[PDB]
Write a protein that holds these residues in place. Sequence first.
Motif: not given
Length: 11
Positions: A1, A3, A6
Amino acid sequence: HXEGXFTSDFX
């Protein structure tokens, strides 16, 4: 992920 990473693409 991606985290808290983005924005990686937004570059």
